[PDB]
Amino acid sequence: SRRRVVITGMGMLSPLGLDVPSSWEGILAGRSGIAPIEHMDLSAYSTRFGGSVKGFNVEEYLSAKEARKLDLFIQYGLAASFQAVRDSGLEVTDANRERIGVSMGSGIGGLTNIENNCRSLFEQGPRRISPFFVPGSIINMVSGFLSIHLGLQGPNYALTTAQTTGTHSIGMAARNIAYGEADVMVAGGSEMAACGLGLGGFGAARALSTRNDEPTRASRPWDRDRDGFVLSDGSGALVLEELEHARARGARIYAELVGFGMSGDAFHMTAPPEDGAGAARCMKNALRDAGLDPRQVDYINAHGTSTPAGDIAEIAAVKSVFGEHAHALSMSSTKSMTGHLLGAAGAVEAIFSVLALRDQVAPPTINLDNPDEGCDLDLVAHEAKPRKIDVALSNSFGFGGTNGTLVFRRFA
Amino acid sequence: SRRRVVITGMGMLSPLGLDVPSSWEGILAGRSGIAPIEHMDLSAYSTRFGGSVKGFNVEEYLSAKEARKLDLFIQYGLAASFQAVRDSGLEVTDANRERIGVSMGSGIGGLTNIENNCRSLFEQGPRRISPFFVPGSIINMVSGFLSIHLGLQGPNYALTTAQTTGTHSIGMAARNIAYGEADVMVAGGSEMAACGLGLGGFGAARALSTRNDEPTRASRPWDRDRDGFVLSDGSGALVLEELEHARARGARIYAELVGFGMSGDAFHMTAPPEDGAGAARCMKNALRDAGLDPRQVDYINAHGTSTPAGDIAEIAAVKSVFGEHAHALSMSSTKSMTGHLLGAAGAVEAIFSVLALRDQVAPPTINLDNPDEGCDLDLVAHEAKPRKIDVALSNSFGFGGTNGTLVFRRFA
Ligand SMILES: CCNc1ccc(C#N)cn1
Ligand SMILES: CCNc1ccc(C#N)cn1
Numbered sequence: 083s084r085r086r087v088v089i090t091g092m093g094m095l096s097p098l099g100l101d102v103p104s105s106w107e108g109i110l111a112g113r114s115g116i117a118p119i120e121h122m123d124l125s126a127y128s129t130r131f132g133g134s135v136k137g138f139n140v141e142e143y144l145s146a147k148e149a150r151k152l153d154l155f156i157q158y159g160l161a162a163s164f165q166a167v168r169d170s171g172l173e174v175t176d177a178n179r180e181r182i183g184v185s186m187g188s189g190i191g192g193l194t195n196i197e198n199n200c201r202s203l204f205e206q207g208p209r210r211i212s213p214f215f216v217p218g219s220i221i222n223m224v225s226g227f228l229s230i231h232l233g234l235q236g237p238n239y240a241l242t243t244a245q246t247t248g249t250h251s252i253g254m255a256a257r258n259i260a261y262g263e264a265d266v267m268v269a270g271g272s273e274m275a276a277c278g279l280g281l282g283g284f285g286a287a288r289a290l291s292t293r294n295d296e297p298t299r300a301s302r303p304w305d306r307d308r309d310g311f312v313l314s315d316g317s318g319a320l321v322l323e324e325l326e327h328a329r330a331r332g333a334r335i336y337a338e339l340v341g342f343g344m345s346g347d348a349f350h351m352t353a354p355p356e357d358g359a360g361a362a363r364c365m366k367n368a369l370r371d372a373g374l375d376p377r378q379v380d381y382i383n384a385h386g387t388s389t390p391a392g393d394i395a396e397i398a399a400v401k402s403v404f405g406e407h408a409h410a411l412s413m414s415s416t417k418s419m420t421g422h423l424l425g426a427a428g429a430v431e432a433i434f435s436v437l438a439l440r441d442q443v444a445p446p447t448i449n450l451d452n453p454d455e456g457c458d459l460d461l462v463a464h465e466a467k468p469r470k471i472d473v474a475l476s477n478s479f480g481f482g483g484t485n486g487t488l489v490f491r492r493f494a
Numbered sequence: 495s496r497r498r499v500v501i502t503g504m505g506m507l508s509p510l511g512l513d514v515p516s517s518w519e520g521i522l523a524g525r526s527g528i529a530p531i532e533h534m535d536l537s538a539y540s541t542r543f544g545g546s547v548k549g550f551n552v553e554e555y556l557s558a559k560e561a562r563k564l565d566l567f568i569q570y571g572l573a574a575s576f577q578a579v580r581d582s583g584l585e586v587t588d589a590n591r592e593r594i595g596v597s598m599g600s601g602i603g604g605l606t607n608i609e610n611n612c613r614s615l616f617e618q619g620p621r622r623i624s625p626f627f628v629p630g631s632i633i634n635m636v637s638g639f640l641s642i643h644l645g646l647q648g649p650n651y652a653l654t655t656a657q658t659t660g661t662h663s664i665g666m667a668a669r670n671i672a673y674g675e676a677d678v679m680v681a682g683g684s685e686m687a688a689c690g691l692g693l694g695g696f697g698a699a700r701a702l703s704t705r706n707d708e709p710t711r712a713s714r715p716w717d718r719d720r721d722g723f724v725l726s727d728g729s730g731a732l733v734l735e736e737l738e739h740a741r742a743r744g745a746r747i748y749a750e751l752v753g754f755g756m757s758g759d760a761f762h763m764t765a766p767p768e769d770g771a772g773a774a775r776c777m778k779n780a781l782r783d784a785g786l787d788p789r790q791v792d793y794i795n796a797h798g799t800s801t802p803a804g805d806i807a808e809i810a811a812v813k814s815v816f817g818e819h820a821h822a823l824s825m826s827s828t829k830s831m832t833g834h835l836l837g838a839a840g841a842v843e844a845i846f847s848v849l850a851l852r853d854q855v856a857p858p859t860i861n862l863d864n865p866d867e868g869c870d871l872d873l874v875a876h877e878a879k880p881r882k883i884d885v886a887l888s889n890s891f892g893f894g895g896t897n898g899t900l901v902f903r904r905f906a
Contacts, residue, residue, distance in 0.1 A: 126619045151763075180775065183758065190632060191654075193608075199691060200612035207538045208694030215695040217763045217893050220601065221633075221654040226894020229758040235775065238758035238896045239662055242603075242633040242654045250651050254666070261673060263756075279612060282620035283627040344675070346595065346641040346650035351629045363592065363647065481629055482638020484650040 084260040088493055090333040091172070091321030092433045093165025095158045095272075097133030097314050097420055101165060105430070106437050109416055109445045110466045114298035116312055116421050119276055127281050129290040131297035133314025133421035134276065151214040152227065153192035154315075159224030159272030160231075162186075162317035162429070166268055167232060170321035171333065174232055181265040183236030184225035185255045186319065187247040189425030189480075190275040192219030197277045224272060236264045245385070247271045248318055248428030249478035249486030253342030255322050265327045270429030272317035284313060287352065291388060301422075302449035303386035303415035304393045304457040311387040314421030318429025320436075337436045337474075338493045343368025347483025353391045354479055358399030361385075361477065364485035365403045368475065372489040377407045379489075380471040381438050383431045385479045386415020386447065387422050392479060397457055412444035412469060414462040419448055428478040428486060435476040435490050443468045499668045500905055502745040503584070503733035504845045505577025505682075507570050509545030509726050509832050513577060517842070518849050521828055521857045522878045526710035528724050528833050531688060541702040543709035544688050545726025545833035563626040564639070565604030566727070570838075571636030571684030572643070574729035578680055579644060582733035583745060586645050593677040595648030596637040597667040598684060598731065599659040601837030601892075604631030606689040636684055648676045654837065657797070659683045660730060661840030661890035661898035665754030667734050677739045682841030684729035696725060699764070703800060713834075714861035715798035715827035716805045716869040723799040726833030730841025732848075749848045750905045752885075753784025759895030765803050766891055770811025773889065776897035777815045780887065784901040789819045792883040793856050795847045797891045798827020799834055804891065809869055824856035824881060826874035831860055840890040844900055847886040851904050855880045 094101060097115025098108030108115065115133045124130040140149040140157045143164050149157060163186060174182060195218060202210040217223060222240035229238050237258050241251045248271035255269030275284075284290045291300035291310045301312040328335055345367060347360030354360065369376055384396050393415075401408045416434050423430055434445060443466050450463035460467075476488045506513060509527025510520030520527065527545045536542035552561040552569045555576050561569055575598060586594060607624075608631055614622040629635055634652040641650050649670050655662045660683030667681030687696075696702045703722045705712035713724040740747055757779060759772030766773065781788050796808050805827075813820045828846050835842055846857060855878050862875040872879075888900045 126621065179760070180757075183756075187654075190628075191603075196605075196608055196691065197612060197615075199695065200609060201616065203609075203690050203694055204613060204616060208690060208697060209538070209540075211691070211694040211698040213698045213700075215691075216699055216701075219695075220656055220893060222656050222892070222894045222896060223763065225655075225758075226763060226896065229760045229895060230763065233760045235758050235760050235772070237756040238894065239653060239655050239658075239666075239756065241651060242599075243637075243651050244632055244634050246634075246651075254651075257669070257673070261669075278615045278620060279608065279623070279627075282615055282623040283611065285620060286623040286625045286627060287629070288625075289628075344595075344649040344651070345592075346637075346647045348591070348641045348645045348647050351635070351638060351642065360647065480634070481632065482634050482650065483641060484634060484638060 086325035087256045087259045087322050087339045088325050088328050089320050089336040089436055090323045090328050091166040091170025093162035093169060093319040094430055094433055095135045095138060095161050095316040096430050102433060109419060109434060112446045112448045114419050116297045116300060128285045128292050129281055130294050132276050132312055135315050151218045153195040153219050154274035155188050155192055155272050156223050158274060158317035159186045160227055162270060162319035163228045163268050166319035166321045179233050180235045182234045183238055183264045183267050184228050184234055185239050185251045185267060185269045186224035187241035187251040187271045187425055188221045188273055189244045189247050191221040193275050193279045194277045195219040197279055243480055243484045245424050245427055245480035246478040246484045246486045247425030249488055252320060252432050252488055253486060256339045256342055259322055259324050265324045267322045268319055269322055270319040271425040273424045273426040274315045275424060276313060276315055280313060299449050301388045301418050303388045303418055303447055304453055304461055305450050306452045306454040308388045310389055312421030314423045316423050317426050318433050335493045337439045337490045340491045341368040341372030341489030343371055343487040345485045349483050352481050354395040358395035360483055360485050361396060361399035361479050362402040364487045368487035368489050376404045378473050379411050379475055381444050381474040382411060382413040383435045383476040384413050384415045385477045386417050409459060412460045412462050412467060414445050414447045416445050431476045432488055435474040438471050439474050439490055439492050442471055496672050498737035499671050499734050499751045500737050500740050500747040501732050501749050501848055502735045502740050502747060503578040503582025505574040505581060505731040506842055506845055507547045507573055507728040508842050514845060521831060521846055524858050524860050526831050528709045528712060530709060539693050540697045540704050541693055542706045544724060547727050563630045565607040565631050566686035567600050567603055567684045568636055570686060570729040571598045572640055574731035575640045575680050578731040578733045591645050592647045594646045595650055595676045596640050596646055596680045597651050597663045598636035598682055599653035599663040599837055600633045600684055601656045601659050602687045603633035605687050605692050607631040609689045609691045655896045656892035657836055657839055658890040658892035658896045658898045659837030661900055664732060664844050665898055665900055668751045668754055671734055671736050677736045679734045680731055681734055682731040683838040685836040685838040686727045687836055688725055688727055711861050713800045713830050715800045715830055715859050716865050716873055717862050718864045718866040720800045722801055724833030726835045728835050729838050730845050747905045749851045749902045752903050753780040753901030755780030755783060755899040757897045761895050764893050766807040768807055770807040772895055772897050773811035773891055774814040776899045780899035780901045788816050790885045791823050791887055793850050793886040794823060794825040795843045795888040796825050796827045797889050798829050820871055824872045824874050824879055826857050826859045828857050843888045847888040847902050850883050850886050851902055854883055
């Protein structure tokens, strides 16, 4: 038998807000976080908009000196992690610090820092590269700096599974707790790829929406006029905790994490199979891991990136898994509002899945004006839908065919 | 209920050879793979040598058409993975493809490709960034492309824990199999950080040996004249397999993976504590996981980076864990010959640990002319030492204070 894992703290930076409650208020109001990117000449680029974090104040978390040493993606991941640990009320002590670990990941890591140090290198040669370039740019430094700041001595690692990062990070942290390797994990992801290389690199793959005239309408999952994803920035962190540990200290418990599934499509480097066979296997694995029948699912936070092929694969995968129940559940893409936070997508969406359980409401898929051929599910078009939600899934289907599904259930 | 995990296939590119047996021949002969770097002009750099892979032929593995799209770190990870799968004798079928996954990690991933695309962006503009820039550079695409080529549909992920990556990748792949998420995993790491940004970045941190005039003597773990690590390139991959699965198909078993430990130092972004307290915690976790008396440990493949603080912290940790038995075991750093393969270090060193068991020989620590203060263990100075080895430990320690330990033992 395995131990039970619950969520006792959450933290976030998103295009909708500088914390969880601000972000969630935006989600339930159908607000878009997408706008023209500022303080950057994107004249030469095919996409000039995305989901920026607005008004982030790193000196709430770090000294100016420690912030200068760290890429924005690390700053964001530390902000969400500190928020999550504060929200949990956990007291770190000599008696528990060996039982508290971190798994905060990133899809792309420190592209901004790499770009600025390429400039130094090409213009002035190697002797002007910053001394803190390597440790301030590498993906495992959110887990590193968080563990140093809070004295965490448990499992310390970082996933990098592209757009699946935040989902895998939370799932694997849940395994650490369930199998007795930790009692508490801080888990999630962070991303800041809005630099020349990010907008330019996704742009060169023609993966991005180029709807520059109407950025708030660009991200339109399952809409027949969708033309690729919207790049966004931010972070999500959850405090995962063994159930008896949480009860013994009187923790507030948001929800229980009952299932985690993984699969590989083994199909294509960037596109999923048309029928979403891999995503279907992954959801089936997660439900098996939770000991739940597909009929018990009420709400799915889709991957829903606004790509032609990805959006239709998810509809096929949900029809396959859920059969006669596929229309009864509600499925929405909060990327319609947040855009695609890449490695942090699964983390902010796990938080939105937990809050859908707390508040008994399916967030909307905004901009779903004209559902595409076969997109006839309950996709919660336009407006939030209050409803019964006992069991909520959150899916991530990323580059490389790598799939993750989390299953959350109401706790009482 | 927890299943046993064995090693049935291994694969490698290192500075000593283009496969496992050629690399291992070099290890036992005390050969250095370190030389001045030829692939670029390093006259402006403070370090101009490293451990390059010599004469890699990607056309043993992939069409030149597909190779052209992939960072060297991906080509190296795929080559090592293909070697390991062939070495295992495993046949991928519809009956087992859902039960075979991959966890191949990297510390930095496609830095060369990032630098080359940054040069396009700065010199020409975003329109000259390669459409393959993202899928050909991001760390999870060894796992992604390997799954596409071989049809692996099991857990598909990638770790990035800096210099601990390969050890964490193998340990957490072993947990997938041990606890029933997979029956087979291909696990390890790959790295090719020898570009201007990499050599420049580690150079700016003053982390590298600057022994340009005698590169084969630069890597000198525990030697009083050491002056930092040597940067090296390559890959290690192992096929991990559930024991009954291996027995059922008549697999050749090299050794059993009995223990894995993780810990965080929670000390410093880059420096290990002088007492090795985090490394001691990690080794103790691994030995308890393996159900061992510490006196059963015969051979330790140290992290042994050739840094002043790293090498002495490892002696302190080994003396703390093993007490008087610390004088009976043999401990060596194969980085003395290979240099530091960063995210691939733990993968090639796990392979060297398995071969130490197969051949009953402790590899040497070359260049250990004058052991430093307190470096008075059996460090296998200069020459390979045949000896009884039932249990072998492989240690890794990385930036962010992240530690991993693998425990292997002979399989009867
Ligand atoms: C060291 C030679 N071993 C090899 C070569 C090619 C492949 C493939 N594919 C697998 N193993
Ligand atoms: C996250 C490392 N720990 C793990 C991994 C997988 C499983 C399973 N099943 C159990 N523990």
